[PDB]
Amino acid sequence: MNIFEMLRIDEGLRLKIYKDTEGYYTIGIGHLLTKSPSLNAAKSELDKAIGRNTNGVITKDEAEKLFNQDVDAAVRGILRNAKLKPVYDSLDAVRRAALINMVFQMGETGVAGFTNSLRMLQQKRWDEAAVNLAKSRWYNQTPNRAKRVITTFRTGTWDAYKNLCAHXAXX
Amino acid sequence: XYXXXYX
Ligand SMILES: *[C@@H]1O[C@H](CO)[C@@H](O)[C@H](O)[C@H]1NC(=O)CCCCCCC(C)C
Numbered sequence: 461m462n463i464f465e466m467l468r469i470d471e472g473l474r475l476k477i478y479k480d481t482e483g484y485y486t487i488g489i490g491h492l493l494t495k496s497p498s499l500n501a502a503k504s505e506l507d508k509a510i511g512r513n514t515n516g517v518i519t520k521d522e523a524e525k526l527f528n529q530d531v532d533a534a535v536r537g538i539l540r541n542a543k544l545k546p547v548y549d550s551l552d553a554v555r556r557a558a559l560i561n562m563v564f565q566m567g568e569t570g571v572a573g574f575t576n577s578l579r580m581l582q583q584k585r586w587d588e589a590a591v592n593l594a595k596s597r598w599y600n601q602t603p604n605r606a607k608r609v610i611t612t613f614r615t616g617t618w619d620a621y622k623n624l625c626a627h628x629a630x631x
Numbered sequence: 632x633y634x635x636x637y638x
């Protein structure tokens with residue numbers, strides 16, 4: 461598998477505008493539309509992004525398009541950052557996806573704040589990395605996700621994402 | 632359905 465499939469497991473999906481739990485209007489695979497509390501503003505942003513009158517509803521293709529751009533944008537954030545880029549460069553492709561995941565979640569600045577863990581990853585110290593990453597606020601607030609990402613860093617394998625089953629809670 | 636999730 462790869463980063464795209466990985467983030468699809470960790471992010472979920474909406475084809476219609478949704479006010480998420482942090483009080484943001486959102487759509488697609490974790491695509492932020494606006495911090496504004498106005499649904500109309502969310503719609504304006506969405507309509508401008510897609511190039512049509514959506515009324516807050518988009519197709520899978522449109523969701524996938526926003527997704528591909530958001531993944532590229534996370535890579536650009538990595539490469540622009542003095543702390544993240546070297547690490548990214550040193551990593552194999554499996555562990556790179558784990559890092560894109562984190563940035564996609566919390567932004568380059570947030571990920572660049574994991575100073576020691578980033579150092580351990582550069583230095584190929586995989587178990588110490590994992591232990592250190594698990595000490596974070598990130599890990600306390602989104603543990604199911606953080607465990608999978610951390611495991612991927614630890615092993616360099618896709619094991620944490622293999623053989624997962626859905627349990628409803630949508631459709 | 633037609634919307635996603637997960638809730
Ligand atoms: C949706 O969840 C259902 C309940 O768990 C599953 O039975 C079903 O397989 C799931 N379907 C899909 O994956 C629909 C295709 C959506 C693909 C969009 C991906 C792009 C990258 C936006």
Ligand SMILES: *[C@@H]1O[C@H](CO)[C@@H](O)[C@H](O)[C@H]1NC(C)=O
Pocket residue numbers: 469470471472626627628629636637638
């Ligand atoms: C979606 O909901 C199910 C069941 O509540 C859960 O297994 C899964 O982790 C959720 N996915 C996301 C991306 O939150």
Ligand SMILES: *[C@H]1O[C@H](CO)[C@@H](O)[C@H](O)[C@@H]1O
Pocket residue numbers: 630634638
């Ligand atoms: C699942 O349920 C939630 C809460 O009712 C909705 O917000 C969502 O649109 C979907 O219907």
Ligand SMILES: [Cl-]
Pocket residue numbers: 533536
């Ligand atoms: Cl950018």
